[PDB]
Amino acid sequence: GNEGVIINNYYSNQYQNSIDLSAN
Amino acid sequence: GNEGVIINNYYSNQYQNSIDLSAN
Amino acid sequence: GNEGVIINNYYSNQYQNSIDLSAN
Amino acid sequence: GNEGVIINNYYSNQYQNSIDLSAN
Amino acid sequence: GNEGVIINNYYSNQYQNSIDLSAN
Amino acid sequence: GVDNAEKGKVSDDNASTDFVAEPVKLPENQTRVSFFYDRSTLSSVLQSTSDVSSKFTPSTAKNLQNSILLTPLPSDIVNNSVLPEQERWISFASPTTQKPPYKTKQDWNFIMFSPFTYYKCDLEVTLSKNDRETISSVVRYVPCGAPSDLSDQTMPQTPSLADTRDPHMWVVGQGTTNQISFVIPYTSPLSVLPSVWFNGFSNFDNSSRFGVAPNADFGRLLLQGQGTFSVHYRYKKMRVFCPRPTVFIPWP
Amino acid sequence: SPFPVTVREHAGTFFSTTPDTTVPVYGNTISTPFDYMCGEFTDLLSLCKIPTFLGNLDSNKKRIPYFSATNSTPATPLVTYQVTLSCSCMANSMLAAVARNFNQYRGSLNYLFVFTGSAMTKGKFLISYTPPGAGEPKTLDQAMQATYAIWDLGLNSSYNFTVPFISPTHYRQTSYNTPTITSVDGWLTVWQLTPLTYPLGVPNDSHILTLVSGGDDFTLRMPVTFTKYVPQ
Amino acid sequence: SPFPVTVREHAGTFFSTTPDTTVPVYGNTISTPFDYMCGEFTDLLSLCKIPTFLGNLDSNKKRIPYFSATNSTPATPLVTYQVTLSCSCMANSMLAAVARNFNQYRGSLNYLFVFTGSAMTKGKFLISYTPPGAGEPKTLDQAMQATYAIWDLGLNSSYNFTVPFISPTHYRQTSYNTPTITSVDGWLTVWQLTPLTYPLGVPNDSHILTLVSGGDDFTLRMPVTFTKYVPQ
Amino acid sequence: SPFPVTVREHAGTFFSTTPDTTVPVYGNTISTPFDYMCGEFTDLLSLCKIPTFLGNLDSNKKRIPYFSATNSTPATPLVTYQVTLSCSCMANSMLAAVARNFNQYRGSLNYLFVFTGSAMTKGKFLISYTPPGAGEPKTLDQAMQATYAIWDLGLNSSYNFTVPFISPTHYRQTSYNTPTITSVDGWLTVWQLTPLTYPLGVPNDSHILTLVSGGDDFTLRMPVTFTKYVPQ
């Protein structure tokens, strides 16, 4: 919430955000 | 009126402008 | 004359330039 | 030599560089 | 490692990085 | 030709009705309400003598407060209110001259030309420092009718105005250009705002100031940091309702 | 990789009329519903077309929305309006109020006259529009030499007169410092062709309401601010 | 070639609510797995809908989560709550705690009453919601003139009462400096219709727990910060 | 997310000739219609091709648009023009006026001579263009050694003479500080081949108007500003 830019993020998703991973 | 940029707005329409909604 | 940019003008043509119109 | 930008030049080629022409 | 931009590099690969070449 | 004005409506003629003539219309759309009001006009002024890292406290100095009420209509401290409220009339700042400036804040262009009873729009605000000394300021935007929260600092040497989740802006430094601009959505609980008069009261015992509608504004702007700042309003996606008279102009 | 940029010479400038938007700081907000509303209008031209009152001078120099006529035919016009959206006689009409906020106009002007005398009163007026170049018309003979319409009183009460757009230029100025051939466009004068005539028991003076508005093909352009004044 | 840019007038400004991100300085990092977790919720509205306690005044002016009723029918309401998410009686409910962080609300409010008297105690209450305009209801006759429900004690212990959203505006303010027609919306009063009735060996005073929460169609909007205070 | 940028070393520079536009502050405006207009031209070269007058010296050192010839054949040229768009003799021709605003030229030059003597006057002129390298031609024998045309008077009044573009370089300078092989290109001299001949009752002196302009394949390039001067 609170992101409203139409062009994709300049930094890749792996870098812009922490990587969510399931341990199971 | 008074908007004359050819490339789309950087911020999404929901964010750039208030959201118009009908109650009926 | 004297415009040599390959990407289109950021402001629409109606706004960047006066609008030419014929009265006849 | 010595131009290594992948996006095309902002100014058209006629303007960015002198125009080469053959007199024959 | 450590490059996370989604749009391609502005400078060509030959210029941005040294050119790797095999002598054999 | 003949007609009957008592009907409450007569035709819009061109020269061809009565004479040997032709219509002479050319396309034009700069008269559209949206286009007309979609430009920035001076609408307020703000002044602060407190530093950024201090507790914000409402103040007035020669008719300039360190906070404003976001509304094109005249606003000012009314009957010793803590913060400025919407006024019902404009007064000269000077008690003698009988010439402007006025002590009241408003978008003169809107007051002088608002041929409608109600309006709806988003508000683009521009705040500019009146001199060239490097800016160092914090502004807090409070939505229409929300708590002003004029509280103490919760931590030492911090701008109390920034101590909020409300939208706020912080500009400072040698790399800045001494101004701030942004756009806020319409936030009033009212469907449309009264552009001139509101023929009623705002609370249930009818004790409020007759003529002022409840929560008829776009919120408030509180500022801290040194300087005098001018404010502009730009009406985005403007929509108006019910035509009404414009302000009278003295006969030439 | 970072993009090289050329900072233009106007960095930091605030353009009050740039056709672009700025940063939204409270987005994803619903604008309080107003679908029940009525009376919305989208063009300021709509206002210009609504006939509103002209201010005529009283015998005591007081402003009134009408002029007087009686059982006689003066050798001079009953009223004279210079065609300029700047004319002081129309200074408070909606047409002028809107025009004050625009630089130029084009198209027809509608001058509406409403006879308010008794039903037993008859008479004829000659409404004339004289283009400039030879000065204001001094006699009925001259006024009839230009664009005119004869208004005969009767069952229908009003007369909708159109001042045709006759101009050397496609657009005309809405105001001016000194009159020029692009800001002043002639005169509208109304003459008494035949005297107002009536039976006994009827007041000698009849009042004719006077209103103005833009015509069908009337337009305005170039949003501007008019010379400020102190209300009073 | 370098791109020409026009530096806007707001260069260097830090917008606390810009809908954009900033530069990641420690990317390609895995967020410690938490897939085993439970109890996650994604909307703050969920909280508003959980009934929490209202603070009623003691005979010693102490705050308690209930009110008293006995074998009599007072001519005045047992409790009166002004419908405002600002009401001091609900100041510590989750509903109010959440609403303090939003500018406006819309929709139903649920007032839950739980009878805690003995199983041998019977009685009926009249819960009324009076919209504003004519002041607070002074008698049962007036209170019944507005929206109301009769609560009869018995096997089921509680009564879920809904204050309908009746408003001139689509949204209402959650707080205010001075009450306005957009921030104060009437009163909820509970009256004793029939006296609490019971057999011998039963305490004369019965306690009714009082809770509030948002209803099914209740919503809040516009994140804001409430007036700060010093905890104590 | 925000885009990383590299501010070039020329930030804030105002380039008077950048091929780019700037911010429109009053857009969506119609340019007053002018479709009725005539006489429009789009290339300044059109002007260069219109023959305009050369300034010849009077016997009193006054400038006149013609030269004199009579019943004799001088051993020296009647007029001598150095081929340079800088020549003082053509300083006020449209060709020179336009060329002063450009750096280089290429192509043909047209020197137009109009015989204004009586219809009874006859005669022949030898118009010569001598390329540089061996100096100005001193005799008719030398002048005939270069490019020339014999002009015979008669029914047709004028002679359109072309100075061919003969140059070591593809383009030549339109002006200079000191003459160079790229800014000065020889001389155009007109000689009297046979004497002007006529009957009695005819004035002895005939006047030949002299004009210049660019030829068919004449071009100019590189917009510049010429050395300023004070009009007088």
Close Cβ partners of H156 (under 8 Å, ≥ 6 residues apart)? none
State how far the Cα of I170 lies from the Cα of I174, in Å rounded to an integer.
13
Residue with tokens 């919760």: F154
Greatest alpha-carbon pair distance for chain G in Å reads 97
Q: Which chains touch H (3 or more CB pairs under 8 A)?
A: A, B, D, E, F, G, I
Interface touch H2/I18, C-beta < 8 Å: no
A-chain residue closest to E2, CA distance: A15
* Beta pairing class for C19-20 and I219-221: unpaired
Residues in chain G within 8 Å Cβ distance of B2 = 17, 19
Helix (H) or strand (E) run with residue C2 in it: none
I-chain residue closest to B11, CA distance: I1
CA dihedral angle for residue G137, residue G138, residue G139, residue G142, rounded to 10 degrees: -30
Report CA torsion sign: F217, F220, F226, F231: negative
Helix (H) or strand (E) run with residue F127 in it: strand F116-129
Tell which F residues from 200 to 239 touch B, by Cβ distance under 8 Å: 236-237
Bridge partners for H139 per DSSP = none
Q: Which chains touch D (3 or more CB pairs under 8 A)?
A: C, E, H, I
The whole-angstrom distance between H9's CA and the closest CA on chain F is 6
Question: Which among I172, I45, I162 is positioned nearest to I106, based on CA atoms?
Answer: I172
Q: Phi and psi dihedrals of B14, rounded to 5?
A: -55, -20
* I156 at interface of C, judged by CB pairs closer than 8 A: no
Which tokens belong to G26?
């409270």
Which tokens belong to I87?
């020549």
**What's the one-letter identity of residue F69?**
L
CA distances from H45 to F245, H42, H83, H97, H165 (A): 45, 9, 19, 11, 17
* I18 at interface of A, judged by CB pairs closer than 8 A: no
State how far the Cα of F233 lies from the Cα of I6, in Å rounded to an integer.
33
Half-sphere exposure of F217 (CA within 13 A, CB side): 25
- Is-contact H29 A18, C-beta < 8 A? yes
State how far the Cα of I70 lies from the Cα of I62, in Å rounded to an integer.
20
The angle formed by the CA atoms of residues F39, F41 and F47, to the nearest 5 degrees, is 140
Instruction: Concatenate the DSSP letters of all residues of H176-196 into one string.
Output: -SS--TTT---EEEEEEEEEE
H12: helix, strand or coil: coil
Question: Which among F168, F171, F187, F189 is positioned nearest to F179, based on CA atoms?
Answer: F171
Residue with tokens 């100014």: D11
Total number of residues shown for chain D: 24
* Beta pairing class for F227-243 and F64-65: unpaired
State how far the Cα of I174 lies from the Cα of I226, in Å rounded to an integer.
10
Residues in chain A within 8 Å Cβ distance of G24 = 4
Half-sphere exposure of G79 (CA within 13 A, CB side): 28
CA distances from G187 to D24, F2, G77, G106, G133 (A): 69, 21, 11, 17, 11
Q: How far from each other are the two terminal CA atoms of chain A, in whole angstroms? A: 27
* Beta pairing class for A19-20 and H30-31: parallel
Question: Which among H83, H66, H96, H77 is positioned nearest to H209, based on CA atoms?
Answer: H66
D-chain residue closest to E11, CA distance: D5
Tell which D residues from 1 to 24 touch H, by Cβ distance under 8 Å: 5, 9-11, 16
CA distances from F93 to E20, F63, F90, I192 (A): 76, 7, 9, 90
Which tokens belong to H132?
């504003």
Residues in chain C within 8 Å Cβ distance of I27 = 11-12, 14-16
DSSP state of F33: H
CA distances from F82 to F51, F60, F68, H177 (A): 20, 10, 11, 10
Residues in chain G within 8 Å Cβ distance of F118 = 37, 39
Tell which H residues from 40 to 69 touch G, by Cβ distance under 8 Å: none
DSSP state of F7: G
* Of the partner residues G19, G30, G36, the one whose CB lies closest to the CB of residue B2: G19
Other beta carbons within 10 angstroms of residue G179's beta carbon come to 14
Which tokens belong to D18?
């002198």
- Is-contact H3 G6, C-beta < 8 A? yes
State how far the Cα of F88 lies from the Cα of I133, in Å rounded to an integer.
91
Interface touch I27/B4, C-beta < 8 Å: yes
Other beta carbons within 10 angstroms of residue H204's beta carbon come to 13
Residues in chain B within 8 Å Cβ distance of I27 = 2, 4
CA distances from I166 to D2, D23, I130, I172 (A): 39, 14, 10, 10
Bridge partners for F75 per DSSP = F86, F105
Residues in chain H within 8 Å Cβ distance of A8 = none
3-state helix, strand, coil in chain E (%, to 5): 15, 10, 75
Question: Which among I162, I149, I175 is positioned nearest to I214, based on CA atoms?
Answer: I162
State how far the Cα of F131 lies from the Cα of F149, in Å rounded to an integer.
29
Question: Which among H204, H71, H190 is positioned nearest to H140, based on CA atoms?
Answer: H190
**What's the one-letter identity of residue H149?**
A
The whole-angstrom distance between G109's CA and the closest CA on chain E is 59
**What's the one-letter identity of residue D13?**
N
* F32 at interface of B, judged by CB pairs closer than 8 A: yes
**Which letter, b or e, does each residue of G47-85 get, where b requires 16 or more Cβ atoms within 10 Å of its Cβ?**
bbbbbbbbbbeeeeeeebbbbbbbeebeeebbbbbbbbb
State how far the Cα of E9 lies from the Cα of G189, in Å rounded to an integer.
75
Total number of residues shown for chain C: 24
Instruction: Concatenate the DSSP letters of all residues of F68-116 into one string.
Output: EE--SS-EE--TT-SS-EE-SS--BSSSSS--S-BSSB--HHHHHS--E
CA distances from H57 to H82, H83, H231 (A): 15, 17, 21
- Is-contact F33 F139, C-beta < 8 A? no
Total number of residues shown for chain I: 232
What was the elucidation method?
X-ray
Total number of residues shown for chain E: 24
Helix (H) or strand (E) run with residue F40 in it: none
Which tokens belong to H8?
């806007």
- Is-contact H100 H152, C-beta < 8 A? no
Residue with tokens 């007053």: I32
Close Cβ partners of I114 (under 8 Å, ≥ 6 residues apart)? I157, I158, I208, I209, I210, I211
Total number of residues shown for chain A: 24
What structural domains and CATH numbers belong to chain G? 1-232 (2.60.120.20)
The angle formed by the CA atoms of residues I218, I224 and I227, to the nearest 5 degrees, is 110
Other beta carbons within 10 angstroms of residue F243's beta carbon come to 16
**CATH number of the domain to which F73 belongs:** 2.60.120.20
List alpha helices for chain I, DSSP H: 45-48, 94-99, 140-143
* G30 at interface of H, judged by CB pairs closer than 8 A: yes
Q: Residue H170, Cα to own-chain centre: how many angstroms?
A: 18
Which tokens belong to G99?
């025009």
Question: Which among I201, I6, I206, I183 is positioned nearest to I114, based on CA atoms?
Answer: I206
Residue with tokens 């955000």: A17
Close Cβ partners of H127 (under 8 Å, ≥ 6 residues apart)? H111, H113, H148, H149, H150, H151, H159, H161, H188, H189, H190, H191
* Beta pairing class for H122-130 and H187-197: antiparallel
Domain count, chain F: 1
Half-sphere exposure of H137 (CA within 13 A, CB side): 30
Close Cβ partners of I63 (under 8 Å, ≥ 6 residues apart)? I55, I56, I57
Q: Phi and psi dihedrals of H46, rounded to 5?
A: -50, -40
**Which letter, b or e, does each residue of H17-37 get, where b requires 16 or more Cβ atoms within 10 Å of its Cβ?**
bbbbbeebeebeeeeeeeeee
Question: Which among I48, I67, I168 is positioned nearest to I108, based on CA atoms?
Answer: I48
The whole-angstrom distance between F194's CA and the closest CA on chain G is 13
Question: Which among G104, G94, G80 is positioned nearest to G212, based on CA atoms?
Answer: G94
**What's the one-letter identity of residue I9?**
E
* Of the partner residues C14, C15, C23, the one whose CB lies closest to the CB of residue I35: C23
Which tokens belong to I29?
């405006």
State how far the Cα of F190 lies from the Cα of H170, in Å rounded to an integer.
7
Interface touch C24/I35, C-beta < 8 Å: yes
- Is-contact F13 G204, C-beta < 8 A? no
- Is-contact G199 G118, C-beta < 8 A? no
Region class of H186: left (phi > 0), else alpha (psi between -120 and 50), else beta: left
DSSP state of I94: H
Other beta carbons within 10 angstroms of residue F116's beta carbon come to 23
Residues in chain I within 8 Å Cβ distance of H4 = 18, 20
* Of the partner residues F171, F181, F215, the one whose CB lies closest to the CB of residue H173: F215
Which tokens belong to I170?
């593809």
Interface test with C, best of B2, B5, B9 (most C CBs within 10 A): B5
Interface touch B14/A5, C-beta < 8 Å: no
Residues in chain E within 8 Å Cβ distance of A8 = 6
State how far the Cα of G41 lies from the Cα of G48, in Å rounded to an integer.
12
List alpha helices for chain A, DSSP H: 13-16
* F185 at interface of G, judged by CB pairs closer than 8 A: yes
* G28 at interface of A, judged by CB pairs closer than 8 A: yes
List alpha helices for H76-148, DSSP H: 94-99, 140-143
Residue with tokens 């039963």: H202
State how far the Cα of G176 lies from the Cα of G196, in Å rounded to an integer.
38
G40: helix, strand or coil: strand
Helix (H) or strand (E) run with residue E16 in it: helix E13-16
The angle formed by the CA atoms of residues F95, F96 and F102, to the nearest 5 degrees, is 55
The whole-angstrom distance between G39's CA and the closest CA on chain I is 27
State how far the Cα of G42 lies from the Cα of G223, in Å rounded to an integer.
15
State how far the Cα of H94 lies from the Cα of H221, in Å rounded to an integer.
16
Question: Which among I4, G124, F190 is positioned nearest to H182, based on CA atoms?
Answer: F190
Q: Phi and psi dihedrals of I48, rounded to 5?
A: -55, -30
**What's the one-letter identity of residue I151?**
W
- Is-contact H85 H96, C-beta < 8 A? yes
Q: Residue F31, Cα to own-chain centre: how many angstroms?
A: 22
Q: Phi and psi dihedrals of C13, rounded to 5?
A: -60, -40
Bridge partners for H232 per DSSP = none
Q: Phi and psi dihedrals of H123, rounded to 5?
A: 155, 170
Residue with tokens 């630089």: G103
CA dihedral angle for residue I227, residue I228, residue I229, residue I231, rounded to 10 degrees: 130
- Is-contact H164 H109, C-beta < 8 A? no
The whole-angstrom distance between C16's CA and the closest CA on chain G is 10
Other beta carbons within 10 angstroms of residue H40's beta carbon come to 6
F170: helix, strand or coil: strand
Instruction: Concatenate the DSSP letters of all residues of G123-154 into one string.
Output: EEEEEEEE-SSS-S--SHHHHTTSEEEEEE-S
Question: Which among F119, F213, F127, F115 is positioned nearest to F170, based on CA atoms?
Answer: F127
Q: Phi and psi dihedrals of G90, rounded to 5?
A: -110, 10
Instruction: Concatenate the DSSP letters of all residues of B1-21 into one string.
Output: ----BSSPPSB-HHHHSPEE-
* G24 at interface of E, judged by CB pairs closer than 8 A: no
State how far the Cα of G159 lies from the Cα of G114, in Å rounded to an integer.
7
List alpha helices for H15-93, DSSP H: 45-48
**What's the one-letter identity of residue G108?**
S
State how far the Cα of G80 lies from the Cα of H85, in Å rounded to an integer.
65
Question: Omega before F101 cis (within 30°)?
Answer: yes
Q: Phi and psi dihedrals of F217, rounded to 5?
A: -160, 180
HEC string for chain F: CEECHHHCCCCCCCCCCCCCCCCCCCCCCCCEHHHHHCCCEEEEEEEECCCCCCCCCCCEECCEECEEECCCCCEECCCCCCCCEECCCCCECCCCCCCCCECCECCHHHHHCCCEEEEEEEEEEEEEECCCCCCEEEEEEECCCCCCCCCCCCCCCCCHHHCCCCCEEEEECCCCCCEEEEEECCCCCCCCEECCCECCCCCCCCCCCCECCCCCCCCEEEEECCEEEEEEEEEEEEEEEEECCCCCCCCC
The whole-angstrom distance between E3's CA and the closest CA on chain D is 18
Domain hosting residue F68, numbered range = 1-252
DSSP state of D11: B
* F241 at interface of I, judged by CB pairs closer than 8 A: no
CA distances from H213 to C9, H112, I187 (A): 55, 8, 104
Which tokens belong to I6?
């590299």
Interface test with F, best of I23, I29, I30 (most F CBs within 10 A): I30
Residue with tokens 């219309």: F25
Residue with tokens 């009077």: I58
C16: helix, strand or coil: helix
Interface touch B11/G27, C-beta < 8 Å: yes
State how far the Cα of C6 lies from the Cα of H86, in Å rounded to an integer.
59
Close Cβ partners of C10 (under 8 Å, ≥ 6 residues apart)? B5, B6, B7
Close Cβ partners of H43 (under 8 Å, ≥ 6 residues apart)? none
Q: Phi and psi dihedrals of I140, rounded to 5?
A: -65, -40
Question: Which among A15, A17, D6 is positioned nearest to E8, based on CA atoms?
Answer: D6
Report CA torsion sign: G9, G14, G17, G19: positive
Region class of F191: left (phi > 0), else alpha (psi between -120 and 50), else beta: alpha
Burial of residue G202, with CB atoms counted within 10 A of its CB: 0-12 exposed, 13-18 middle, 19 or more buried: middle
Bridge partners for I162 per DSSP = I110
